[PDB]
């Protein structure tokens, strides 16, 4: 019986880009959500299936805590039945979404003068994504007909693009960090609640 | 698969490249324009070269796509905006000579310096020398000499330069499949292949022709009144039946007539409306000016400015430790960053210009979500249009009576309102005839219908017939008077101001009639009328994604330029002049000259 280590999850300092969205399985621990709820200092805290409080004393078999960073205006992109770049090619949500989506401003950390370029996101793809899949396979997207043998050039573009993060951005373009907690309800023994 | 999806993919990637490059360049240019330092200019020119070369190579890559093999309009709009190679496509030798022409003429205009015939080492540059020389002075001879000298030093130099400039430019436009370059300047207004909103290049010339046709009587009464007044000011140099001195237009040319207002006050005993001492006594500062402008813009339902705008932008003269080119400008660095740059003092003029720039920035805040190349006005005038309408609104006596800058027991009536009208006239009615004269003059030049050996000669005739100003000096082919002005010498399309002037007043009528206003337009305000604000936003949110005239109709309900907004706006002043001019003439002869003694 241990507390679910949400702490060094929500406020670690190295978050990956969406195209390689990070995921950690949480189980075999007791989970104290209501503290993270009543933190109440986030810029957005939604989810789809339970009141913020009632989820506390109703529990699951396992949960997945995924993290990434996106641009502000695209927080709306992350929700069941949502479309758009980060929704269709980078992070796709199922429609019976069990988890919760928390998102906070991070402009004072993840951006810096000159513009950070560590953070990435995929720009094109032959077709949209399945639910919940990670894709680091990065072969050139074929935009035209001429097979150009893996090079940058005309109708051959690299599927990844670097976010521009200069801290003088509008809130809609300043970076926003996002965590999502996908719960499952299965037949496994007593591994998740608190 | 198809061509069109490929083009959209291309534009997608191009958006997130050009956005970032433009942000870098804009931020660098800003950091320069706020604090004059050398390596700032260095990194600025670096980023600017980056952005420019990137744009050129993108245009070359883009021309690899067929135009008519695309059907979705927006894509065609973006691709015509991008693929137009322009001067870049001509021969590298000729393009280099062209770049030299630009820098040469511009630097001669911006560094030209006139020196009195008595002192070879005491003399004045244009800015701000000749400006005040022509504005604050009442001196006949001073203005005469300054006029001729400034037309002598730079213009006579730049004459063949501008000639060959026109030549290479028309060859360039031919290479762009344009009939000539003035046509290319028109081409921004051109609209193709959309039902109910077609627009030809010559459709524009017809538009401007007709607009000025109905404008004619207003400006004719204006000329009459000013002629009478300056005659009272200069009995030995104005006959009340002819044109006006080309050296007494308050400035070097007659682009604005505000300076003559001081001379032609309609009633020099009624106090003029200003709250400068008032804003002082009430302990205001630039910060509070802009906060009140934000309050106003909220009062029309638009979103208040971004937090980043407040914490980031430079709003006041940054002390005396650093100097900068802080002429009032409003920057949209893209990607959600919007700033205003102005060494804001505290006065009524700053109060107006602050709202002007706030209109600029709000306008840009509207169309953030559109693709890159659409992040600009429906035309090349709507920016200054929205920037001028908010100012015009706030400058009414009543809106000031609202937020407590005027005496709540103020008595506003006939004489003072005609004063305010005639002032705003000299500001805004002034630009119509002069602007149109110059624009169509340059259009004929690009149309080459005028032999070089007669340019100046026909020049003043247009000044003569269309605008009514007489030259003070005999002019042979030694003159290049057009280049004697910034936008000409600096090669800027000059119609945009005429178009802006018309569009703002169409906007004024549209919004006041949509704000359920009753009565005189010249007293109108939009604030607190969320309905009219929503009306305006309904167009602001388009930028230039829709054809511009569709955007205009989304405001006024007329699909074309209309001047009757203007004459209606002024009709108080119109009748007033129609009375004032009973005993004096309107109209002039094309032969007269002050030196035709
Ligand atoms: C991370 O930052 C939040 C503020 O949003 C703070 O409440 C939290 O305590 C920090 N993390 C840790 C482990 O303290
Ligand atoms: C202007 O820029 C220089 C170089 O970045 C800087 O050292 C200086 O402090 C700036 N001016 C002011 C008033 O800070
Ligand atoms: C053009 O494409 C955009 C997005 O690709 C789409 O929203 C729009 O509807 C298209 N144009 C028309 C006329 O449907
Ligand atoms: C801007 O106006 C909105 C309109 O309701 C308001 O909610 C918001 O608080 C204002 N901005 C700030 C920083 O308070
Ligand atoms: C706008 O509405 C507010 C709220 O009543 C009022 O205090 C203010 O005087 C109004 N101003 C104008 C110009 O209507």
Numbering used by the authors:
A (entry chain E): 333 to 526
B (entry chain A): 19 to 615
Give excerpts from the publication:
SARS-CoV-2 cannot infect standard laboratory mice due to inefficient interactions between the receptor-binding domain (RBD) of Spike (S) protein and mouse ACE2 (mACE2). Deep sequencing identified three amino acid substitutions, N501Y, Q493H, and K417N, at the receptor binding domain (RBD) of MASCp36, during in vivo passaging.
All three RBD mutants could bind to hACE2 with affinities at nanomole (ranging from 500 to 20 nM). The same as RBDMACSp36–mACE2 complex, the interaction region could be divided into three patches, the three adaption-mutated residues (K417N, located at PI; Q493H, located at PII; and N501Y, located at PIII) were located at the three patches, respectively.
